[PDB]
Amino acid sequence: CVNLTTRTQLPPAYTNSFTRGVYYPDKVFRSSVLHSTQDLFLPFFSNVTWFHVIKRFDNPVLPFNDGVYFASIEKSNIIRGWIFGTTLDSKTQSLLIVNNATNVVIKVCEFQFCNDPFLDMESEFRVYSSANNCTFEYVSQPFLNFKNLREFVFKNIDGYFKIYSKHTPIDLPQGFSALEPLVDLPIGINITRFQTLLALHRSGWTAGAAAYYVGYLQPRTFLLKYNENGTITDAVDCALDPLSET
Amino acid sequence: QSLEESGGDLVKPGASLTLTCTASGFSFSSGYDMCWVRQAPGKGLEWIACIGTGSSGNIYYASWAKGRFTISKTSSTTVTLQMTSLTAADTATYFCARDDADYAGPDYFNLWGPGTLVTVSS
Amino acid sequence: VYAWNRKRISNCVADYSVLYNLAPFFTFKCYGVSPTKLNDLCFTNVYADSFVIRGDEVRQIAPGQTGNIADYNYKLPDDFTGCVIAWNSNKLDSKVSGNYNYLYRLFRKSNLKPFERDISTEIYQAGNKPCNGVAGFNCYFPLRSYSFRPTYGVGHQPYRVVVLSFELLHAPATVCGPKKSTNLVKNKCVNFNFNGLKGTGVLTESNKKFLPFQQFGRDIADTTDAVRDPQTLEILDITPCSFGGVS
Amino acid sequence: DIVMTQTPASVSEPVGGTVTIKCQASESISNWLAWYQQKPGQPPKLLIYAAFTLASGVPSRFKGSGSGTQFTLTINGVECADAATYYCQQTYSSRDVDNVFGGGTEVVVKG
Ligand SMILES: *[C@@H]1O[C@H](CO)[C@@H](O)[C@H](O)[C@H]1NC(C)=O
Ligand SMILES: *[C@@H]1O[C@H](CO)[C@@H](O)[C@H](O)[C@H]1NC(C)=O
Ligand SMILES: *[C@@H]1O[C@H](CO)[C@@H](O)[C@H](O)[C@H]1NC(C)=O
């Protein structure tokens, strides 16, 4: 664990949500039909929190609320993983996700996180100090001019941790792209805060040009349009403005 | 009983040697087990590989001694160990461990032989 | 038995048909669940406890049972859920010199709590004068060594006992059993039931290409018309069998 | 599978003093463990098999304590002739093991 004092204090940047925050609600199949569903969805044209990393070092701990929408304008895969928990120490069991150079690491355990977790050719992992009572582990295939857009939606309902992902090549651009459900985790711990994980190049340490966005889910009603293939193409918010309500 | 060793001498690197453990006063019975160990001149003991003296030899090997070494029983009172591609770090003092229980592996060793020294030079 | 090993089993499918060659002459008498329907059952928690006890002491492994093994070596809770397996091991745990390597706790201050292990080697004081490290009269070693006697009956022979403890939540399940499969039949009126989804219809080949995460298929009437087979990843059309009014 | 460590590496107590050597295993080995002591230029001999039972021809001072993962050997007294190295063997599961024997621990008796 290494303490970082090179942080530049600055109020967070902000940007519009536009038309992002859509995922397939279920595993059922509908084609060329319109269905309305009530679920935790990201409100359209909301203002999300923007962090810029470059000497900008933005690694705060944000509240989880009822859900989180994660997007990041990426190149060279600066963002590595996420840390989830409530107390962020060994007192309460926490959660860890890291996509190293080989695979993805899934571990739920009473970790003891470093004060400034980060990563450092990358062969230096300093993000935690200990793990006391481990419950579940998993290893799978690795998840991965600005040319990479990655959208992530994390939810925690009924002790299940749902993750939705989408990889896109390209502030937030305008468009539409639904998010498929990636993996479900039957963990059953309550999450109130989190913090992302980054990789730092050592030459001091140099951070590349990248940014990430954080959105918050809310209980709304959406109307979604399925194409003839079977995928979502357009959606309409049902509580944004009176025209959309009609 | 004695388990005096044999076949120990200076050997060139990348070569083969034949170490023979000969029992005296008893034969290799099936109900009791035998094993092979060696001791480096500077550090502690280690286990490489050995086979049981029963009707069905339950041969067992160590992780770092997976395929380089070869042990077989030639008579009721004579067992030999064969190693190939010998390296500089293979020099040690070899002992012929005598086990007390046939649980398919090295159990408590009550008796050892005097042992032999095998060294490498060029 | 005094230092009984404890093992965790999870994130796997439990196959109980193997436990006939590995453990012949086994007794599957157990509590808390029907032994037969364990194949199609899901366990969220599994504990494994294995040790060796004498033949006369195998009956002591039961909830609410008192005895030498129960009070001082391994105590079972009254509300014990899970099953125990015991089989003879005379061919394996019997020596011509003697099986002197297995020890059990004989003297102990108080009866052990359920699912507890005691590895203490302190000299037991059964009198008034303190032992002070002396193992003389009124001062006996708490652990005695089994002396298995294969010449006598099975009660004086080494018995290998494996104790399995579950919880049976069958909702956050991590251990389950193979649900098997059925010879798919196509192009006829069929009573189907896929993962609890019971229905009647004609199962035909489906041209739809719904996504890997995507499992079912719904229609305008909000009824399941397309399904993907759990046994084999294939797309099927569920069509209600031909019908109509007669006049 | 099972990795065993022996600590401390070096110990030194007076002739009337007491020294203890503990043997730790990566996972539980129950009752299966043995203690071996070798003098320089001499193969080791079994001292404490089954971690509690004393061997034959050995002084009672040699003993054993602990079970499962941690095993401790307590020396009640030395007489300037027991200064040697002590090893512990796993003798529990040797299917694929680099070395059943534990680490080296020599004893120095300052007479
Ligand atoms: C976020 O955007 C809204 C407009 O949708 C604006 O009113 C608000 O001031 C913005 N937030 C900040 C911190 O400026
Ligand atoms: C959910 O987790 C939080 C952690 O802060 C805890 O306070 C709360 O009691 C938990 N709820 C339940 C139902 O366990
Ligand atoms: C999917 O829809 C597109 C039009 O959006 C169409 O061109 C394509 O042929 C469809 N897929 C298949 C397999 O026909």
- Measure CA C154 to chain center: 25
Which amino acid type is present at position A196?
T
Ligand closest to the CA atom of residue A84: 2
Approach to solving: cryo-EM
* Residues contacting residue C185 through CB under 8 Å, at least 6 positions apart: C203
| Distance separating alpha carbons of residues B64 and B68, to the nearest angstrom | 9
D99, two tokens: 């070395």
- Burial of B6 per CB tally in 10 Å (0-12, 13-18, 19+): middle
Classify the C-alpha dihedral A38-A44-A48-A52 as positive or negative. positive
The residue of C73, C100, C101 whose CB has the most chain D CBs within 10 angstroms, and thus the best one to mutate to test that interface, is C101
As a whole number of angstroms, the distance between CA C60 and CA A88 comes to 46
Cβ distance A24 to C218 less than 8 Å, yes or no, reads no
SS3 content of chain A, % helix, strand, coil (to 5): 0, 55, 45
Ligand nearest to C-alpha C209: 3
Domain CATH for B93 = 2.60.40.10
Q: Which residues of C touch A181 (CB under 8 A)?
A: 213
Residue having the nearest C-alpha atom to atom 14 of ligand 2: A190
Contact (CB, 8 A) for D76 and D61 = yes
Tokens encoding A186? 């039957």
Tell which residue, A194, A151, A157, A235, has the closest CA to residue A64.
A194
Residue-range domain boundaries for chain A: 13-246
Look up residue A133 and give its DSSP letter.
Answer: E
Ligand 2 atom at shortest distance from the alpha carbon of A87: 5
Which residue range forms the structural domain that includes residue B98? 10-120
| Residue A104: exposure state from Cβ atoms within 10 A (0-12, 13-18, ≥19) | middle
Residue with tokens 């001019």: A145
- Residue with the smallest CA separation from ligand 2 atom 4 is A190
- Cβ neighbours, 10 Å, residue D51: 28
Does residue B4 lie within any of the structural domains? Answer: no
Examine residue D8 and say whether the peptide bond preceding it is cis (omega within 30 degrees of 0): yes
Structure tokens that stand for A203 in this block: 């030459």
**Please, is C61 exposed, middle or buried when counting C-beta atoms within 10 Å of its C-beta (0-12, 13-18, 19+)?**
buried
Taking every pair of Cα atoms in chain C, the longest distance, rounded to a whole number of angstroms, is: 105
Q: How many residues does chain B have?
A: 122
CA C151 to chain centre: 32
E strand or H helix that includes residue A245: helix A242-245
Residue D102 is part of a domain; what is its CATH number?
A: 2.60.40.10
Q: Is residue B21 part of a domain?
A: yes
Q: Can you give the residue range of the structural domain that contains D79?
A: 4-109
Q: Which residues of B touch C97 (CB under 8 A)?
A: 100
CATH number of A13-246: 2.60.120.960
Per the structure, the count of domains in chain B is 1
CA-nearest residue, atom 7 of ligand 3: A229
Residue to mutate (ligand 3; options A225, A226, A229; most atoms within 8 A of CB):
A229
Overall resolution, Å = 3.7
Neighbours of A36 (CB within 10 A): 11
Residue B2 inside a domain? The answer is no
* CB A89, CB A113: distance < 8 Å: yes
Positive or negative torsion for Cα C149, C153, C159, C163: negative
Are the C-beta atoms of residues A214 and A49 closer than 8 Å to each other?
A: yes
CA B61 to chain centre: 11
Q: What is the 3-state secondary structure (H, E, C) of chain A?
A: CCCCCCCCCCCCEEEECCCCCCECCCCCCCCCEEEEEEEEECCCCCEEEEEEECCCCCCCCEECCCCEEEEEEECCCCEEEEEEECCCCCCCCEEEEEECCCCEEEEEEEEEEEEEEEECCCCCEEEEEEEEEEEEEEEECCCCCCCEEEEEEEEEECCEEEEEEEEECCCCCCCCCCEEEEEEECCCCCCCEEEEEEECEECCEECCCEEEEEEECEEEEEEEEECCCCCEEEEEECCCCHHHHC
Instruction: Give how many domains chain D has, as a whole number.
Output: 1
Ligand 2: distance of its center to the CA of A132 in Å?
A: 20
Q: Which two tokens stand for residue C243?
A: 């019908």
User: Residue A147 in contact with residue A169, Cβ under 8 Å?
Assistant: yes
Tell me how far apart the 2 most distant CA atoms of chain B are, in Å: 43
Yes or no: say if B50 and B66 are a contact pair by the CB < 8 Å rule.
Answer: no
Contacts of D6 (CB under 8 A, 6+ apart): D21, D22, D23, D24, D86, D87, D88, D102, D103, D104, D105
Whose structure tokens read 């989408």?
Answer: A166
Distance (Å, rounded) from C-alpha C79 to C-alpha B16? 63
Subunits adjacent to chain C (3 or more Cβ pairs under 8 Å): A, B, D
The closest alpha carbon to C61, from C160, C128, C145, C153, belongs to: C160
